[PDB]
Design a protein around this ligand. Structure first.
Ligand SMILES: Nc1nc2c(ncn2[C@@H]2O[C@H](COP(=O)(O)OP(=O)(O)OP(=O)(O)O)[C@@H](O)[C@H]2O)c(=O)[nH]1
Ligand SMILES: Nc1nc2c(ncn2[C@@H]2O[C@H](COP(=O)(O)OP(=O)(O)OP(=O)(O)O)[C@@H](O)[C@H]2O)c(=O)[nH]1
Ligand SMILES: Nc1nc2c(ncn2[C@@H]2O[C@H](COP(=O)(O)OP(=O)(O)O)[C@@H](O)[C@H]2O)c(=O)[nH]1
Ligand SMILES: Nc1nc2c(ncn2[C@@H]2O[C@H](COP(=O)(O)OP(=O)(O)O)[C@@H](O)[C@H]2O)c(=O)[nH]1
Ligand SMILES: [Mg+2]
Ligand SMILES: [Mg+2]
Lengths: 55, 430, 99, 427, 427, 430
C-alpha cells in the first residue's frame, strides 16, 4: 500500500512541474511576440506615414 | 440595433461633418459609393442587400458649403434629401437666423429628421454641431433645439459646439450671438461639449508637427474624439459606456452640464517611433493644461467628475494603477463632495489611421471628458466683451430690425450672470 | 574541481583548483551549456555539433572552466594553468574537435 | 434533486455568468454543443442540479439572462459556449441602462418585470423540487443594482421558503467605475438586507492584488478575474453534485454561519492559488491549504479581518483526504489566534469534505467567513453618500424618475443601523 | 529536529551569508541548484535543521536576506548560488542605505519591519520545533546596525524563549571603512545588550593578521576572510547535525559560559590553521590543537586576553579522537597559566566532542571564550565617540531623522556601566 | 532599478555633456544611434525594439551650443524635447539670467525634468553642472535649484561646478556672479563639487603630456571622475558606495559641504608602460598638491573627511596598508576631532579608454574627494576682489536695471562672510 501511494504522489508532482515549465515557455514566447509587433509598427511609421506624404 | 442620429448646422458643422464621415466610412470599410469592396446599423441603413446610407442631415442657409458635397466624390453616398440648403445666410445675425429666415426652413428640416427617426428602431440620442459665432449656428440652432425638445422629450440630445476663442476672433458681433444662444442652449440641451479653435491651433502646432495648419486638420482631431465616444456602441470592449451614462455621470446639476475635451497621445509620426507611450504615459498627458482643447487652465478652478475612455491594447489592471497615481498628483484639485470622481471605459478596437493623416498610429490611446469650474473663466471674458459693446449699444439696430425685441438682450444677459454665480457656488465647499 | 579552501588552490593564480584523478567523485561530473545569458531555454535538448561553442560547467560548483594566461615549467614544456571561475570575456568557451 | 435556478443581471452578471458555465461544463464533461462526452459515471449522477435534458442527449442549463440593453448579450453568444443557452431565456429591453438605480427600478424595470417573472416561472416549476435561486449582479451599476433587487422582492413574495443566494461585487475604495455609486449602493443594501438569505461581497481591487501578488500575471484581464470568482460559485454547490464524507449544502451553511437575521454578509477566498514559478517549491499538504485560506491577503474582499472579530467561519475541502487531518487544522487555527474570535461562540469553524476535486488539482479548498470587519466597507459608502447628500448632488436625476427623497433617508437609516448592529455584537 | 532560521542583513551580512551557504551545502553534499549529490547516508540524518524540502528532491535553506538597497541582492542572484534561495525570501527597499543608524532604525526600518516579520512567520511556524534564530550583521553600517537591531527587539517580543544568536563585526580601531562609525557602534550596542542571548564579536584586523601570519596569503580578499568566519558559524552548530561522544548545542553553551545575563560578549578562534605549503610537515594531534586555540594570535577579535582575565571558556572538538587526551589538555591549560583564570569559579573550561569533521581535515577544534579583555574594544570606540560628540554637528544628520541627543547619552551610559561591570568581576 | 538624472546648464555644462556621454555610451557599448552591435538602466531608458535614450536634459539660453549637438554625430541618440535652448543669452549677467530671461524658460524645463522623473521607479538623486562665471550658469542655475528644492525635497541634489581660477579669468564680472550664485547654492544644494580650469591646464601638461590643450581635453578629465563616482551604482564591487553614503560621510556641518577632487594615475599612454602602478604608488600621487584639481594647497589647512574609490584589480588588504601609511606622515594634517576620516569604495570595472583620447589603458585607478579648510583660501581671494570693484561701484548699473534690487549685493557679501567664519570655526580645536 505505502509503495503504491508514494509512487502515485511522485508521478503527480512530476506532471505538475512539467506543465509549469510549459507555461513558462509560452510566457517567454509572448514577450517575443510583443517585440515583433512593436517593430512592425515602427516599420509602418518609418516607410508609409511620412511627412512627404501628408495630404 | 442601437442608433444615433447626427445633425450638422452651418459652415463649421457641415465641413466638420464630411471629415467625420470620411473617418467613419474608412473605419467600417465602406467605399465612397456606399458599397463594399457588423456595427453599420448604429450609423447606417441598408437599402437592398448592397447599399448603405448615413443617418445624417446637413443644414445651412446658404448653398456654397452644401454644394461642395453635392459635386464631390461622396455625393453618391448621401440621400439627396439629407442635404438641405437655404437661399441666403443669416449674415452672422442671430435675429435673422431665428425669426425672419430661420422660420422659412425650420419645418422642412423637422420632417426630415423625424422621418429618419422612424428608421431608427432603437434610437437613443442625437448629435448636433454648432459654431457659436455663426448666425445660423446660433440662431437656427436655438430654434432647432426648442422644437426638438418637445418633439422627442426623453431622448439624450448631445451637442458638440465651438466656443469662441479668448483672443482669436473672426466676427465683431461674436459676443452677441453666443450669449443669446446660450440661454436657449442651457434649458434644452442634455449636455454640450466645449472646444475652441485657438487651443486646437496651439495643440496641432506643438504636439502635432505642422507649421501652417488649416481647418481641415482641426476637423480631423474633432473626428477622433467623436469616434472614440461612439466606439462603445459599435465595437467590443471590457467596459462599455452608453450615451445615457454620460448624461448622469458627468453633470452634477441641471445647468452645470458643459464639459471640456482632451485627447492623448497627439504625436507626430517620427516622434511616436521615439517614445514608449504606455498606459500611464497617456493618462499623465491628459491632465496637462497644454492638451486641453479649451484654452482655460484647470488650475484656476476645480475638477468635478471626469470620464475616461481608453482604446486599443489597454488592460484593466494598468488602468487602475494609472488613475490611482493621478490622484496622488497634488497639482490636480477635486471638489470635496466628489470622492469617487471618475468613470472609466476600455475598448479593444484601436484608432483608425487615415490616408495621408498626420497623427501617428499608437496601438493604445485615451480620450477624456472632464467637467471643471475653470470654464467660468471663459464666461467672464465673453461677458466682459458683451458688456463693453452693449453699454453704448453698438449693434442693437441690426438685431431689432430683423424681428428681435430688445428686452431679450438684458434677460439673456441676466441668465448668463446667474450661471456665473452658479459656478461660484459649486466651487465652494463645506 | 574543488571549492577553494586553503588546502585546494591553483598553484599559480591561487584561484579555484582544477585537477586530475582516478577516484569516482561527484566533482568529476561536467555539465554542458550554451553561450549566452538566456540561451539555454531555446536549445535545452539539441545535439551539440563538432566545433560548436559551448561552456563546460562543474555540477557541484556550477562554474565554467577557464584557461588563465599563466605558465609553469611542467617538464613536458610550458603549459597554461586551468581554473574554474567566474565567466568573463571569451576564454571560457570550448569547442570539441574530432581531429 | 435539489434544483437551482440561475439569474444574471447586467453587464457584470452576463460576463461572470458566461465564464461560469465554461467552468461547470468542463467539470461535468459537456461539449459546447451540449452533448455528453465524459469519462466517468459520477458526472451524470446529479447533473439535474443545474441542467435540463432536451430529448436527444442535449443538456440545457437553467440560466436566465437579464439586461436593459442587449449589447452585452450579443457579445456573449459570439463566445464559444453561447450556443448552449435556450434562446427564449434571453430577456432584454430596448432602452439604455442609464447607470441609474431609480431608472432601472421604476421606469424600465416595471416593463421588464412582467415578462422576466414568467421566464423564471417556467424554470422554477419544471423540476421535481427546488432548493433556491442563484443571483449574480453588481451593486455599483444601475441595471444589476436596480433591476436585480426588484426581482429579488418578487422572488421572496412568491417563493418565501427557498434560499435566495446572491453574489455581489462591491464598489472599490480607491478607484471605482462610477460617480453615483454611493447613491446606488446605499439603496441596494436596503433591498438586500430584508429580502436575501445569503450575500457574498467581492471587491475588484482584491482580485487585482491576488493576481499580481500570487499568480504573478503580468497583465490580468477580466477573463482571469472572472475565473477566480467561478471557482467559489463552483465550490459552494459541489456538495450537491458529488458525494462526500461530510455533506454540507446551502441551508447548512446559512444555519451555522448566520447567528442573527440581518448579519449575513460574507467574505470568501480560494486556495490553492499557485505562483507560476513557486510551485516547484510548494508541496501540497492539508496544512498548506489551511495557511492560504485564513491568510488575510487571500481574502477576495478588501476588508481586513484582523481589524475585526470573527463570528463564524467555514472551510470546504475537495478531494480524497484524511478526515483527521482536516479536523485537526480547525482546532489548531482556532486556538492559535484566539484574539480574532468571539468568546460566547465556541467552535467557530465549520468544516466539510467533498470527494471530487477540480480538474488538474488533486486537492483544493474554499473559505466563507463572517466578521465585524464589514463595518469598514459600510462606513466608506456612508461617508461618501452623506457628502453627496449634504449638498444636493446628482440627486435631480433620480428625483425626475419618480423616486421620493424619503427613500434615501429610509435607505441610509437602515444602512446605519446595520453598522451599529455589528458594533454591538463585538462586545 | 532543532530547526534554526537564518537572517542576513545588509552588505556585510549577505556576503558572509553567501559564503556561509557554500560551506554547509558542501558539508551536506548539496548541489547549488538544490539537489543532493552526496556521498554518505549520515548527511541526511538531520539535514532538516537548515534546509526545507520541496517535492522534487530540492532542498531550500531557511534563509531570509534583508537589505535597504537592491544592489547587494542582485550580486547574490547573478552569482553562482542565485537559484538556491526561495524568491519570496528576498525583501529589499527602494531607498539608499544612508550609512546612517538613525535613518535605518526609524525612517526606512519601520516600513520594511512588518514585511520582514511575516516572512519569518512563514519560516518560524513551518517546523515541528525551533531552537532559535541566527542573525549576521555589521555594527558600523546603517542597515545592519539600524534595521538589524530593530528586528532583534521584535523577535524577542514574539519568541522570548528562543535563542537569538548573533554574529557581529565590530569597527576596526586603526583604519576603518566609515567615518560615522562611533555613532553607529555606540547606539547599536545598547540594543544588543538587552535583546540577544549570545553575541559573537569579530574584527577585520585580526583576519588580515591571521591570514598574513599563519595562512601565508599575500593578497587576502574578502572571500577567504569570510571563510574563517563561516568555519566558526558551522562549528558551533555541528553538535546538532551529527552524532558524537558528548553533545553540546547552543543552550548548553549559553548556560555554561554566561555567569550573568549582561556579560555575554564572546571572542572566537579556530584551529588548526596552517600554511598551504607547510601542512605536509605538521603532525596535527589533540595537544597540537590546544596550542593554537588558546594562543592569543588566533583570536578573531583584536582583544589580547593577557591584559584581562578569563571568566569562562569553551572548546569544541570534531573528529574521531581520544576522550582522555581531550580531558587532559583542559586540566593542563587551566593549571599551567593560573594567572589568566578567575579563582572563584573552578573548572572554567568546557569541552565537547563531535564525530564527523569538516572536509579535508581529520580533526579540528573551535574556541569560544568570555573575558574582561573586552574592555579594550569598548574603550576605543567610546573615546572616539566622545571626541566627535564634543562637536555636535555630525549629530545633525541624526537629528533630521528624529533621534534626540538624549539617546546618545542613554546609549553611552549603558555602555559605560557594562565596562565597569567587567572590571569588578575581575576581582 | 537605481537611477540618477543629469541636468546640464550653460556652455560649460553642454560641452561637458558631450565629454561624459561619449564615455558612458562607449563604456556601456551603445552605438551613437541607440543600438547594440546590465547597468544600462541607470543612465539609459529602453523604448522597445532596441533603442536607448539618455536620462538627461541640456539647458542653455542661446541656440549655438545646443545645435552643435543637434547637428552633430550623436544627434540621433538624444530625444528632441530634452534639448532646450532660449533666445538670447544672459550676457554674463546674473540678474538677467535670474529674473528677466531665466523666468521666460524656467517653467518649460521643470516639466521635462518631472516628466523624465515619471520613468524613474528608483530615483535617488540628480547631477547638475554649472560654470560659476557665466550668466545662465549662475542666474538660471540658481533659479533651477530653488524650484527643484521644493518640487522634490529630500532627494540628493549633487553639483559638479567649475570654481573661478585663482588668477585666470575670462569675464570681468566674474566675481559678481560667483558670490551671488553662492548664496542660492548653499541652502539648497546637498553637496557641490569644485574644480578649476587653471589647475587642469597645469595637470594636463605636466602629468599628462600635452603642450597645448583645448576645452575638449579638459572635459575628458572630468568625464573620468564622474564615471568613477557613479561606477559603484552600476557594477559589482567588494565595497559599493551609494549616493546617500557619500552625502553623510563627507560633510561634517550643514554649510561646510564643499569638497575638492583629485584623480590618479594621470599619465601619458607612452610613459604608462613604464611603471607597475601599485595601489600604494597611485594613492601617494593623489595627496600631492600638484595633482589637485583645485589650486589650493592642502598644507595651508587641514583635512575634514576623505573618500577613496578604486577601479581595478585592487585588493582590500593593500588598500588598508596604503591608507595606514599616509596617516603616519605628518604632511597630511587632520583635525584631531575627526580620528577616522575615510570611506573606501571598491569596484571591479577598470577605467575605459576613448579613441583620440589623452590617457592610457590603466589597469587600476583611484579617485579622491575630500573636504579641506584649505578651500577658505579660495573664498578669501574672491571676497577681496569683489570688495575692490564694489567699493567704487564698478558695475552695479547693469544688474540693477535687469530687475535685481541693490540690497542683494551686501546680503550676498554678508552671507559669504558667515561662510568664511564657519570654515575658521571648524578649523578651531579643543
Ligand atoms: N473647427 C472649425 N471651426 C470652423 C470651421 N469653419 C468655421 N468655423 C468657425 O465657425 C465660425 C463662423 O461661423 P460659420 O461657420 O459661418 O457658421 P454659420 O451658422 O454658417 O454662419 P452663417 O454664415 O450666418 O450661416 C467661426 O468662429 C469659425 O471659427 C471649421 O472648418 N473648423
Ligand atoms: N572647464 C571648462 N570650462 C568651460 C568650458 N566651457 C565654458 N567654460 C567656462 O565657462 C565660462 C564662461 O561662461 P559660459 O561658458 O558662457 O557659461 P554660461 O553659464 O552659459 O554663460 P552664458 O553663455 O552667458 O549664458 C568660462 O570662463 C569658462 O571657464 C569647458 O568646456 N570646460
Ligand atoms: N469582475 C468583473 N467586474 C466587472 C466586469 N465588467 C464590469 N465590472 C464591474 O461592474 C461594475 C458595474 O458595472 P455596470 O456597467 O454598471 O453593470 P450594469 O449593472 O449592467 O449597469 C463596474 O464597477 C465594473 O468595475 C467583469 O467582466 N468582471
Ligand atoms: N569581514 C567582512 N566584512 C565586510 C564584508 N562586506 C562588508 N564588510 C564590512 O562592513 C562594514 C560596513 O558595511 P556596510 O556597507 O555599511 O553594510 P550596511 O550595514 O548594510 O550599511 C565595512 O567596515 C566592511 O569592512 C565582508 O564580506 N566580510
Ligand atoms: Mg451658414
Ligand atoms: Mg549660456
Amino acid at each position: 500500500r505505502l509503495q503504491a501511494e508514494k509512487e502515485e504522489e511522485e508521478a503527480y508532482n512530476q506532471k505538475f512541474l512539467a506543465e509549469q515549465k510549459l507555461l513558462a515557455k509560452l510566457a517567454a514566447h509572448e514577450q517575443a511576440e510583443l517585440k515583433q509587433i512593436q517593430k512592425d509598427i515602427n516599420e509602418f511609421r518609418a516607410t508609409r506615414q511620412r511627412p512627404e506624404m501628408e495630404r | 440595433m442601437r442608433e444615433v442620429i447626427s445633425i450638422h448646422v452651418g459652415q463649421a458643422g457641415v465641413q466638420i461633418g464630411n471629415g467625420c464621415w470620411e473617418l467613419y466610412c474608412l473605419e467600417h470599410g465602406i467605399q465612397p459609393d456606399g458599397q463594399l469592396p457588423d456595427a453599420f446599423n448604429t450609423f447606417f441603413s441598408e437599402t437592398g442587400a448592397g447599399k448603405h446610407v448615413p443617418r445624417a442631415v446637413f443644414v445651412d442657409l446658404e448653398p456654397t458649403v452644401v454644394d461642395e458635397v453635392r459635386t464631390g466624390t461622396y455625393r453618391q453616398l448621401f440621400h439627396p434629401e439629407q442635404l438641405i440648403s437655404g437661399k441666403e445666410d443669416a449674415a452672422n445675425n442671430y435675429a435673422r437666423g431665428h425669426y425672419t429666415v430661420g422660420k422659412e426652413i425650420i419645418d422642412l428640416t423637422l420632417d426630415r429628421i423625424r422621418k429618419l427617426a422612424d428608421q431608427c428602431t432603437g434610437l437613443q440620442g442625437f448629435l448636433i454641431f454648432h459654431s457659436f459665432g455663426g448666425g445660423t449656428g446660433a440662431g437656427f440652432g436655438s430654434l432647432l433645439l426648442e422644437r426638438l425638445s418637445v418633439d422627442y422629450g426623453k431622448k439624450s440630445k448631445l451637442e458638440f459646439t465651438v466656443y469662441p476663442s479668448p483672443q482669436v476672433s473672426t466676427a465683431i458681433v461674436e459676443p452677441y450671438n453666443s450669449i443669446l444662444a446660450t440661454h436657449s442652449m442651457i434649458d434644452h440641451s442634455d449636455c454640450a461639449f466645449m472646444v475652441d479653435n485657438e487651443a486646437l491651433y496651439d495643440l496641432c502646432r506643438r504636439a502635432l508637427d505642422i507649421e501652417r495648419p488649416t481647418y481641415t486638420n482641426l476637423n480631423r482631431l474633432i473626428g477622433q474624439v467623436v469616434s472614440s465616444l461612439t466606439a462603445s456602441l459599435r465595437f467590443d470592449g471590457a467596459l462599455n459606456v452608453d450615451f445615457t451614462e454620460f448624461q448622469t455621470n458627468l453633470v452634477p446639476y441641471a445647468r452645470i452640464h458643459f464639459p471640456i475635451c482632451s485627447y492623448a497621445p497627439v504625436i507626430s509620426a517620427e516622434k511616436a517611433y521615439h517614445e514608449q507611450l504606455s498606459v500611464a504615459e497617456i493618462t499623465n498627458s491628459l491632465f496637462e493644461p497644454a492638451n486641453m482643447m479649451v484654452k482655460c487652465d484647470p488650475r484656476h478652478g476645480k475638477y468635478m467628475a471626469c470620464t475616461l475612455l481608453y482604446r486599443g491594447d489597454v488592460v484593466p489592471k494598468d488602468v487602475s494603477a494609472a488613475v490611482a497615481t493621478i490622484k496622488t498628483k497634488r497639482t490636480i484639485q477635486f471638489v470635496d463632495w466628489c470622492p469617487t470622481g471618475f468613470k472609466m471605459g476600455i475598448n479593444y478596437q484601436p484608432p483608425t489611421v487615415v490616408p495621408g493623416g498626420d497623427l501617428a498610429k499608437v496601438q493604445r490611446a485615451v480620450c477624456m471628458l472632464a467637467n471643471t469650474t475653470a470654464i467660468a473663466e471663459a464666461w467672464s471674458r465673453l461677458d466682459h466683451k458683451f458688456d463693453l459693446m452693449y453699454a453704448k449699444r453698438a449693434f442693437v439696430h441690426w438685431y431689432v430690425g430683423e424681428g428681435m425685441e430688445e428686452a431679450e438682450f438684458p434677460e439673456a444677459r441676466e441668465d448668463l450672470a446667474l450661471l456665473e454665480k452658479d459656478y461660484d457656488e459649486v466651487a465652494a465647499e463645506s | 574541481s574543488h571549492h577553494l579552501d586553503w588546502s585546494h588552490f591553483s598553484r599559480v593564480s591561487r584561484k579555484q583548483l582544477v585537477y586530475s584523478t582516478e577516484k569516482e567523485t561527484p566533482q568529476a561530473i561536467w555539465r554542458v551549456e550554451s553561450v549566452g545569458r538566456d540561451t539555454m531555454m531555446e536549445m535545452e535538448g539539441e545535439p551539440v555539433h563538432i566545433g560548436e561553442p559551448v561552456l563546460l560547467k562543474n555540477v557541484t560548483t556550477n562554474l565554467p572552466l577557464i584557461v588563465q594566461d599563466a605558465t609553469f615549467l611542467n617538464d613536458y614544456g610550458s603549459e597554461h594553468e586551468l581554473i574554474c571561475g567566474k565567466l568573463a570575456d571569451k576564454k571560457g568557451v570550448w569547442t570539441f574537435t574530432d581531429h | 434533486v435539489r434544483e437551482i435556478v440561475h439569474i444574471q443581471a447586467g453587464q457584470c452578471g452576463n460576463q461572470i455568468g458566461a465564464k461560469f458555465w465554461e467552468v461547470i461544463s468542463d467539470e461535468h464533461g459537456i461539449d459546447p454543443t451540449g452533448s455528453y462526452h465524459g469519462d466517468s459515471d459520477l458526472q451524470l449522477e446529479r447533473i439535474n442540479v443545474y441542467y435540463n435534458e432536451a430529448t436527444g442527449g442535449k443538456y440545457v442549463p437553467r440560466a436566465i439572462l437579464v439586461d436593459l440593453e442587449p449589447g452585452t448579450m450579443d457579445s456573449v453568444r459570439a463566445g464559444q459556449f453561447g450556443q448552449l443557452f435556450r434562446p427564449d431565456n434571453f430577456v432584454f429591453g430596448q432602452s439604455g441602462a442609464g447607470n441609474n438605480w431609480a431608472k432601472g427600478y421604476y421606469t424600465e424595470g416595471q416593463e421588464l418585470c412582467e415578462s422576466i417573472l414568467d421566464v423564471i416561472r417556467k424554470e422554477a416549476e419544471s423540476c421535481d423540487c427546488l432548493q433556491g435561486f442563484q443571483l449574480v449582479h453588481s451593486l455599483g451599476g444601475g441595471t444589476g443594482a436596480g433591476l436585480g433587487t426588484l426581482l429579488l422582492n418578487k422572488l421572496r413574495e412568491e417563493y418565501p421558503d427557498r434560499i435566495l443566494s446572491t453574489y455581489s461585487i462591491v464598489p472599490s475604495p480607491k478607484v471605482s467605475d462610477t460617480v453615483v455609486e454611493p447613491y446606488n449602493c446605499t439603496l441596494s443594501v436596503h433591498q438586500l438586507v430584508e429580502s436575501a438569505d445569503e450575500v457574498f461581497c467581492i471587491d475588484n481591487e482584491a482580485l487585482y492584488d491576488i493576481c499580481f501578488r500570487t499568480l504573478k500575471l503580468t497583465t490580468p484581464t477580466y477573463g482571469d478575474l472572472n475565473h477566480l470568482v467561478s471557482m467559489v460559485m463552483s465550490g459552494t454547490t459541489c456538495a450537491l453534485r458529488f458525494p462526500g464524507q461530510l455533506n454540507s449544502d446551502l441551508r447548512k451553511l446559512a444555519v451555522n454561519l448566520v447567528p442573527f437575521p440581518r448579519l449575513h454578509f460574507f467574505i470568501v477566498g480560494f486556495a490553492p492559488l499557485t505562483s507560476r514559478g513557486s510551485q516547484q517549491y510548494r508541496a501540497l499538504t492539508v496544512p498548506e491549504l489551511t495557511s492560504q485560506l485564513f491568510d488575510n491577503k487571500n481574502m477576495m474582499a478588501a476588508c481586513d479581518p484582523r481589524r475585526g472579530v470573527y463570528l463564524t467561519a467555514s472551510a470546504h475541502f475537495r478531494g480524497r483526504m484524511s478526515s483527521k487531518e482536516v479536523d485537526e487544522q480547525m482546532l489548531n487555527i482556532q486556538a492559535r489566534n484566539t484574539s480574532y474570535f468571539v468568546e460566547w461562540i465556541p467552535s467557530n469553524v465549520k468544516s466539510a469534505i467533498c470527494d471530487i476535486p477540480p480538474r488538474g488539482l488533486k486537492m483544493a479548498a474554499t473559505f466563507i467567513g463572517n466578521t465585524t470587519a464589514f463595518r469598514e466597507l459600510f462606513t466608506r459608502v456612508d461617508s461618501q453618500f452623506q457628502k453627496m447628500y449634504a449638498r444636493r448632488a446628482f440627486i435631480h436625476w433620480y428625483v425626475n424618475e419618480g423616486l421620493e427623497t424619503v427613500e434615501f433617508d429610509e435607505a441610509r437609516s437602515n444602512m446605519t443601523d446595520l453598522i451599529q448592529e455589528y458594533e454591538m455584537y463585538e462586545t
